[PDB]
Amino acid sequence: HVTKRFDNPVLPFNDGVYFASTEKSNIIRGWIFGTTLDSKTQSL
Amino acid sequence: VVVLSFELLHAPATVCGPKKSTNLVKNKCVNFNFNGLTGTGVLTESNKK
Amino acid sequence: LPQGFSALEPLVDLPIGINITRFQTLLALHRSYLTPGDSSSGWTAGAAA
Amino acid sequence: QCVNLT
């Protein structure tokens, strides 16, 4: 929190991403995948 | 009247017909089809997992 | 990061056959009685790396 | 359903 750390911008996807998250509060819920990130394409 | 539109695309298929299963047999050096493996041998048991 | 060994087992493979180019990681927020509880700059960030 | 952080 100290300040006000909340980075999470859009990031490009490259073949194979190793997501290593050290969690004790399980803040990270899900993830989205797609191309245009709007109701203009399919998105998972 | 029910009309069926069958489409076949380049997205992974996910609907198909059923599949049979054969009776269990041991002590025979015969042919078997496990998931597409056509092999010939005696299907003995094992202890390893 | 730790010095152990990794051995990731597969979870599931859902074949959707869509083009994936961009992604975004979903976080979560918390509202306390020591913050306005607004959806702007007053929330509980938490700790995660 | 959109609201943005400042």
Breaks (C-N over 2.5 A) in chain B follow: none
First to last CA, chain D: 17
Residue C21 token pair:
């180019």
Cβ–Cβ gap A25/C23 under 8 Å = no
Reported for A34-42, long-range contacts at CB under 8 A and 24+ positions apart, including other chains, are: A34/C18, A34/C20, A34/C21, A34/C22, A34/C23, A35/C19, A35/C20, A35/C21, A35/C22, A36/C22, A37/A10, A37/C22, A37/C24, A42/C16, A42/C18
User: What is the distance in angstroms between the Cα of A5 and the nearest Cα belonging to chain C?
Assistant: 7
Count Cβ–Cβ pairs < 8 Å, chain B vs chain C.
Answer: 10
**Gap from C4 CA to chain D (nearest CA, Å):** 39
* Chain B contact present for C16, CB below 8 A: yes
Q: How far apart are CA B44 and CA B31, in angstroms?
A: 13
Q: Resolution in A, one decimal? A: 4.2
